[PDB]
Design a protein around this ligand. Structure first.
Ligand SMILES: *C(=C)C1=C(C)[C@@H](Cc2[nH]c(/C=C3N=C(/C=C4\NC(=O)[C@H](C)[C@H]4[C@@H](*)C)C(C)=C\3CCC(=O)O)c(CCC(=O)O)c2C)NC1=O
Ligand SMILES: *C(=C)C1=C(C)[C@@H](Cc2[nH]c(/C=C3N=C(/C=C4\NC(=O)[C@H](C)[C@H]4[C@@H](*)C)C(C)=C\3CCC(=O)O)c(CCC(=O)O)c2C)NC1=O
Ligand SMILES: *C(=C)C1=C(C)[C@@H](Cc2[nH]c(/C=C3N=C(/C=C4\NC(=O)[C@H](C)[C@H]4[C@@H](*)C)C(C)=C\3CCC(=O)O)c(CCC(=O)O)c2C)NC1=O
Ligand SMILES: *C(=C)C1=C(C)[C@@H](Cc2[nH]c(/C=C3N=C(/C=C4\NC(=O)[C@H](C)[C@H]4[C@@H](*)C)C(C)=C\3CCC(=O)O)c(CCC(=O)O)c2C)NC1=O
Ligand SMILES: *[C@@H](C)[C@H]1/C(=C/C2=NC(=C\c3[nH]c(C[C@H]4NC(=O)C(C=C)=C4C)c(C)c3CCC(=O)O)/C(CCC(=O)O)=C2C)NC(=O)[C@@H]1C
Ligand SMILES: *[C@@H](C)[C@H]1/C(=C/C2=NC(=C\c3[nH]c(C[C@H]4NC(=O)C(C=C)=C4C)c(C)c3CCC(=O)O)/C(CCC(=O)O)=C2C)NC(=O)[C@@H]1C
Ligand SMILES: *[C@@H](C)[C@H]1/C(=C/C2=NC(=C\c3[nH]c(C[C@H]4NC(=O)C(C=C)=C4C)c(C)c3CCC(=O)O)/C(CCC(=O)O)=C2C)NC(=O)[C@@H]1C
Ligand SMILES: *[C@@H](C)[C@H]1/C(=C/C2=NC(=C\c3[nH]c(C[C@H]4NC(=O)C(C=C)=C4C)c(C)c3CCC(=O)O)/C(CCC(=O)O)=C2C)NC(=O)[C@@H]1C
Ligand SMILES: *[C@H](C)[C@H]1/C(=C/C2=NC(=C\c3[nH]c(C[C@H]4NC(=O)C(C=C)=C4C)c(C)c3CCC(=O)O)/C(CCC(=O)O)=C2C)NC(=O)[C@@H]1C
Ligand SMILES: *[C@H](C)[C@H]1/C(=C/C2=NC(=C\c3[nH]c(C[C@H]4NC(=O)C(C=C)=C4C)c(C)c3CCC(=O)O)/C(CCC(=O)O)=C2C)NC(=O)[C@@H]1C
Ligand SMILES: *[C@H](C)[C@H]1/C(=C/C2=NC(=C\c3[nH]c(C[C@H]4NC(=O)C(C=C)=C4C)c(C)c3CCC(=O)O)/C(CCC(=O)O)=C2C)NC(=O)[C@@H]1C
Ligand SMILES: *[C@H](C)[C@H]1/C(=C/C2=NC(=C\c3[nH]c(C[C@H]4NC(=O)C(C=C)=C4C)c(C)c3CCC(=O)O)/C(CCC(=O)O)=C2C)NC(=O)[C@@H]1C
Ligand SMILES: *[C@H](C)[C@H]1/C(=C/C2=NC(=C\c3[nH]c(C[C@H]4NC(=O)C(C=C)=C4C)c(C)c3CCC(=O)O)/C(CCC(=O)O)=C2C)NC(=O)[C@@H]1C
Ligand SMILES: *[C@H](C)[C@H]1/C(=C/C2=NC(=C\c3[nH]c(C[C@H]4NC(=O)C(C=C)=C4C)c(C)c3CCC(=O)O)/C(CCC(=O)O)=C2C)NC(=O)[C@@H]1C
Lengths: 184, 164, 164, 184, 184, 164, 164, 184
């Protein structure tokens, strides 16, 4: 796998040239502590996120838990919970690395085809990923609502700035969006 | 490709783990150590031709026989390739300084190097000498900060050991 | 036991490698982050009894049914063991804070926990609530610095996620 | 494996108590940069160390490279050069971790018995380890002599203090002493 | 795998008949010493042939050693040298056996597909094989030139006949041409 | 298919070796011994019908019961097939003489023979007797040279051994 | 130890086989070829000092730099080991001639040679030149028969190729 | 494994010297065809030898085929027949090589211990091997008796010499004796 820095190196090696622009990478370092917080905000809340996302996928499409549904029986519900957590885990890998390659290589490649063979509806999967995308954004910004959290509300306590890590939110989102692209 | 972050990601994935405490700490290391190694990377970026040229000159100076007929520095094509090889290593070192792991040097320089040089009958002592000259050449703060020089020298010694 | 340094050593040994630049970089991270997590570690060391008592109190207040006949907090032996369990987790968190990895919590708390509580008919919700209390309880700068509290909460969430 | 910190944790768990005295451990952090230089000093000069030490073991004992000798023929010499590097590698691991457990668990345990079965001479093994111990100390102090190094002399260029990291030198030598004890 | 003799037996078995026409096979025996020399001629010079053929392939196509070229970086040059040796080794098997089946079965089968998946360029692969084909012919004829060999020239000193084993030269070339066809 | 050259090629391939000294030597043995076994192969090629016929005749006279109703030589079809089988073995022996290794016999005759005769209720003793007759029948110099006869008999014993 | 007979035995044993046709043929080749290779093995055993001495001299004449301070032929001890090494190879070649397989060269010379020479900074070009000289040196019938010279030269080339 | 020539080489290497005394080796080559006939003599009669030898062991000790006997039931009889063939097979290898090492390393090492744990009676095993030894001698001499063979008598038809290969008879016998020694 690659990270933000080895990505720049691979692009430089394509022309057998030294890496000259180290500005975008200097900014990577400058926002390093932020990035660490964003990963911490997802990892720390992963279990709540996954269960709430799969439960939300289900409450929006009851067919999933009725007769013939792909979250039925217990074995399938458990497999689905597992998958949502796997996808979230590789997304957090990508965010910590600053590069999608670990997500592409080890999670998304061949996944659509795997689900097709199995009959796992990619559309419901996309929805669970959409919910996790929204969860992640709010945890990174440290602005989760009580409405969506209940007694499970967590606050991260990271040092606040006006943009609330807008760029990292966008980056995190792009990774979820890669998942969604891959399953469509 | 091996870096601080890909190493801990790879270990977490083998165990099916989210990034945890020790993974974030490891990456904090990258944040701290990046200034020194990126300093060296920028200096190398701006001056790699001169750095490589003098390291190449030194290995030929050590081993004049290389210029003799049938030897590895004896023709114009041979001379140009030897200097180019020296520059390859410095560029891979530049890459490794940016990444902060030996990844680029492992994969694109060291892997297969023994087999290539054996096959072509290229002696390994002049490679070592060119890298050894470069290793002993720098001083701080003239060339770069002391910690930048430490990062620079560490990758040169890494390459030297891979040939020894 | 998983820490910054045992993770990179394990990785290097798997590849038959000497410690290299990214290994040393990772360890610089633990050096940097140590102040924050050891501050937490000291606070917890010096106040572990009170931290655990109120967290145990919280879960029992949340779940009064545990005092009922035949339930997990109904006898003196039970009440004693439940408080003790909360305290066990807080001590392993303290351990993990010193180490800078989840190692101690992984090996001595989490591993086997589900099997044990299943066998004994111990509900997991009280464990989660006790830890959840502790997780929401602290505030900076009153209890410790913001970064020390981050380190503390991170290990609590880690333990919470292991039961969730 | 354990490190300096988990070793302390293990000792605290024995009395199921918190780790209270972080004195030696605050000290460990304070000397952390020195420790990294010391590991760099050994790793960066490992090839030179191994070759010089095995050749030293040999020039002090010609029986090794004559018929019947344990460094004869080419295959045995290569095996020996390999073993010297392996032991050095595991010593550097212990020095980086600040605990011998990785050296004991993964290298030393069972090694006396393996060499006994093989007929690998303990007296020669000890001398090779002795020279490497001598090398490491000089490299950690950054005081190698031109005498022993010749054209291959290397200066590390670390910030100098009076005792020249006396503590770490003693620690390093204690790991080499563990290897010798394990074999003898 | 088949040899020249089991090949004939396979053809006889296709009509469940005894092998009666032993003319070509008594001839194979009569030229047995020649065949062993021809195989000795290639095997003895194989390292020099492979390095020279790969060097030749490159000096005719500098693209291979520039950015994006398939003999770049060191890893790829090494894999290419390996493949040239492998192909030559299987050709020498074919020549020793007097039958292409070991080469077809163990080397050529599926190789085109393998190369296509990796992006190993056919034009250059064929060229390396072409040079090894010319090398082999010259070494079997024991007429290598100082012009191509320089200081590495080798003379086999086999008993000379006027045709200089033209039949074995043609057979050797047929195996190389099978490689080329297979890669085509 | 096993012969002198395939065996050493297969061994060489398993270790990634070019043919070397012992491989070439082994093939010289094929050159030297070819005269004797090809003499035998040519005598057999030219007279296989009569050779197989008397071997077949021998096994039926040893086991007249085969001619009884319900037995393996009792019908015109059974008789033809039994003689055919004997001829098959002689033909594979002819092949093994040509090749100079037991490959043809191994692959097209011995492999599966025991499952086939078990499945079909064919006793093995008449096969053994037919081959045994053929083994005892020849004499040198009458039928072929002494060394040709040795090659011929060795393959017959090999076949007999495979059924015994 | 690889030879004609151990190769076919290893192959037979792998398959649970008694020695058969192609095994005995193979060994016949060793009988036939032995006169040539034992001629060489005798010529070598009776003159190895002189043969190794002029080979060694040739590699030093080719590479005078080896005599310079700090190079691999500069001290009396160093000169003695290099010649000793040249004689080692010729003696393993003598063994290989006796055996009729590369086994002795394989096990006692080639195995580990790369790792040894790279560890000690020993250039391989002079090793190759010494063997190359010996390979080009002989002529028949002057030194031995043309076939004995073939056997001699093949093992020299086999050793050269292991280093190239 | 070693053969007669690699054995001499191993002993010559022990003093880092050339192989000068080609005395016993020229003799080995001179007896080459004989040796081949001796191996052919055993290999060609192997099935008859094994069944007769195991039958002989049993007719001398009926306890073996009664309840509690080591050749009872069918599975044990089959195992014993197999073992006899295995031993004879390795003895033929040793004979072909002119050296016992293959027999020692691949067959006899640890066999006594294997048999003692299984309860395979040493005395009966020795007897089977003794009978095979006597069979081998007669077949190598090409003097099997009608008395012992019955309808299954085989004559090898090798060229007769007065001592009838006494040297090779003693050698084969020595290999059988190694088996008996190792199982004693
Ligand atoms: C079924 C009837 C049904 C649901 C179940 C629920 C699913 C759902 N959840 C969100 C949004 C979020 N969920 C969050 C999760 C958590 N917040 C916490 O503090 C804890 C740690 C954790 C577990 C409860 C978060 C942070 C969000 C972000 C929004 C917010 O206000 O916090 C959505 C909306 C997703 C979207 O915007 O597309 C849904 C659908 N909803 C159901 O209908
Ligand atoms: C054989 C005739 C023979 C030897 C070979 C040699 C072996 C030997 N070496 C030492 C001590 C050291 N070797 C060192 C190695 C190096 N120094 C460098 O700068 C480069 C990078 C590297 C390879 C050359 C070092 C650092 C030492 C420490 C001492 C010093 O630096 O001065 C010893 C002494 C061991 C001891 O003290 O017990 C020996 C025996 N000596 C031979 O006689
Ligand atoms: C790059 C500028 C370039 C080359 C490198 C070179 C490649 C090349 N080589 C040949 C032909 C042969 N090479 C041979 C090799 C050897 N000869 C020896 O005696 C030693 C043992 C060995 C290694 C050097 C041989 C035997 C030949 C046969 C021809 C001959 O001997 O004259 C070719 C020609 C291919 C052909 O003829 O079709 C080429 C292109 N040429 C380069 O331009
Ligand atoms: C039980 C009643 C009983 C026996 C069974 C038998 C066992 C036995 N066999 C021998 C000796 C030999 N057997 C030989 C075998 C064969 N000869 C052949 O020609 C075919 C190919 C093959 C299978 C029948 C041979 C060659 C001998 C050598 C002696 C000889 O005259 O040929 C012995 C004697 C062994 C000894 O001397 O210790 C025994 C005990 N005998 C039984 O009593
Ligand atoms: C968006 C992600 C957040 C947010 C993040 C910010 N964090 C800032 C500083 C900061 N964060 C940490 C913790 C981090 N570093 C580590 O080494 C580890 C664990 C190993 C972690 C989790 C530290 C140590 C620091 C620096 C100290 C400090 O500044 O207090 C930060 C300020 C710096 C910057 O602007 O980049 C921000 C903005 N803040 C937000 O607004 C949202 C909620
Ligand atoms: C005994 C080992 C040495 C010696 C060591 C000292 N090093 C000191 C400081 C220092 N070293 C480094 C490099 C190290 N830190 C890293 O993060 C990495 C790679 C990731 C490495 C290799 C740093 C960054 C520092 C601190 C900055 C500086 O001091 O320049 C040091 C001074 C601090 C202290 O006293 O502990 C010492 C003494 N010095 C010696 O005398 C011998 C040769
Ligand atoms: C084309 C390949 C050559 C060429 C070859 C010839 N070799 C001839 C005879 C010959 N070769 C050998 C060595 C060979 N036999 C072996 O057993 C082994 C290894 C175990 C090898 C390498 C021998 C023993 C002999 C026979 C003795 C002799 O003639 O000295 C030969 C003459 C016979 C024939 O015409 O087939 C030829 C032509 N000759 C050439 O012109 C090119 C260069
Ligand atoms: C004791 C074993 C025998 C005996 C053996 C003799 N065999 C003699 C010669 C001979 N044998 C063969 C066949 C052998 N050579 C092969 O290459 C192969 C298989 C590939 C085999 C089985 C040949 C070709 C020859 C040489 C030609 C000939 O002599 O007819 C032999 C005479 C030579 C010598 O004295 O060593 C003997 C004595 N003789 C006996 O009396 C017992 C029964
Ligand atoms: C949950 C959001 C889904 C859903 C998921 C199901 N997935 C099922 C099986 C399954 N899933 C994967 C992919 C997963 N494994 C991996 O290794 C990785 C990445 C590294 C991922 C993403 C695989 C390979 C398999 C098959 C093997 C297995 O069972 O683990 C599954 C069971 C299918 C069945 O047995 O019928 C389900 C139910 N289903 C849903 O309804 C939502 C949309
Ligand atoms: C410390 C004062 C040293 C010392 C240093 C000198 N270096 C000199 C020239 C020089 N050095 C380099 C390598 C340097 N340039 C780089 O870009 C990088 C890494 C990216 C390094 C390590 C180059 C290319 C040059 C030539 C161009 C230049 O002048 O910078 C130098 C001038 C005289 C000379 O060439 O030797 C000095 C004095 N010299 C010493 O004696 C102490 C130990
Ligand atoms: C408190 C939040 C609980 C509760 C807990 C009880 N636990 C009981 C027994 C028990 N607990 C553990 C886990 C503990 N031991 C450890 O070594 C570690 C980590 C190092 C931990 C967290 C174990 C292994 C056991 C069984 C062995 C033992 O008796 O200690 C327990 C007694 C139940 C019984 O004997 O059946 C209780 C009551 N009780 C509560 O009400 C909440 C749910
Ligand atoms: C060199 C300083 C010695 C010497 C060393 C030899 N060791 C030989 C074999 C050998 N060594 C080891 C231990 C090594 N392998 C490991 O995995 C680890 C720790 C992780 C270590 C330290 C093993 C297991 C083996 C056997 C397997 C193998 O060969 O790799 C050896 C060859 C002995 C032989 O085969 O005859 C030598 C020569 N010998 C010396 O004379 C000096 C004192
Ligand atoms: C040696 C003198 C024997 C002996 C031999 C006799 N064989 C007789 C006839 C015969 N033998 C065969 C088999 C033979 N022909 C082959 O083509 C091959 C191998 C390819 C072999 C082994 C056949 C087919 C025949 C009939 C045709 C013919 O006459 O050749 C024979 C004639 C009388 C008879 O048929 O029995 C003799 C005397 N007889 C002996 O008693 C000694 C020991
Ligand atoms: C053949 C016409 C050559 C040629 C041959 C010459 N060789 C000369 C001397 C010489 N050669 C060797 C190597 C030889 N001795 C061995 O023991 C073995 C193998 C074990 C071999 C290959 C030695 C050791 C010597 C010196 C002792 C001696 O004279 O026998 C020679 C005499 C002059 C000289 O030293 O060069 C000749 C003419 N020379 C040629 O030009 C053609 C091509």
């Amino acid at each position: 796998m690659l990270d933000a820095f080895s990505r720049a190196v691979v692009q430089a090696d394509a022309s057998t040239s030294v890496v000259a622009d180290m500005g975008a990478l200097k900014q990577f370092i400058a926002e390093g502590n932020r990035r660490l917080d964003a990963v911490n905000a997802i990892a720390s809340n992963a279990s709540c996120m996954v269960s709430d996302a799969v439960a939300g996928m289900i409450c929006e499409n009851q067919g999933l838990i009725q007769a013939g549904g792909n979250c039925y029986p217990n074995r399938r519900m458990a497999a689905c919970l597992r998958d949502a957590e796997i996808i979230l885990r590789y997304v957090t890998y990508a965010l910590l690395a600053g590069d999608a390659s670990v997500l592409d290589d080890r999670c998304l490649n061949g996944l659509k085809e795997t689900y097709a063979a199995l009959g796992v509806p990619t559309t419901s999967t996309v929805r669970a990923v959409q919910i996790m995308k929204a969860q992640a954004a709010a945890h990174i910004k440290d602005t989760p609502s009580e409405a969506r959290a209940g007694g499970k509300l967590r606050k991260m306590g990271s040092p606040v700035v006006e943009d609330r890590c807008a760029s990292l939110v966008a980056e995190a989102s792009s990774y979820f969006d890669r998942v969604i692209s891959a399953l469509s | 490709m091996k870096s601080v972050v890909t190493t801990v990601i790879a270990a977490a994935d083998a165990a099916g783990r989210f990034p945890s405490s020790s993974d974030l700490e490891s990456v904090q290391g990258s944040i701290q150590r990046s200034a020194a190694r990126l300093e060296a990377a920028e200096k190398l970026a701006g001056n790699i031709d001169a750095v490589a040229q003098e390291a190449y000159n030194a290995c030929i100076q050590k081993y004049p026989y290389l210029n003799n007929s049938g030897e590895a520095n004896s023709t114009d094509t041979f001379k140009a390739k030897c200097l180019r090889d020296v520059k390859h290593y410095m560029r891979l070192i530049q890459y490794s300084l940016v990444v902060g792991g030996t990844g680029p040097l492992d994969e694109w320089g060291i892997a297969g190097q023994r087999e290539v040089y054996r096959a072509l009958g290229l002696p390994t002592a002049p490679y070592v000498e060119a890298l050894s000259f470069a290793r002993n050449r720098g001083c701080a703060p003239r060339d770069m900060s002391a910690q930048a020089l430490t990062e620079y020298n560490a990758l040169l010694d890494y390459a030297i050991n891979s040939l020894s």
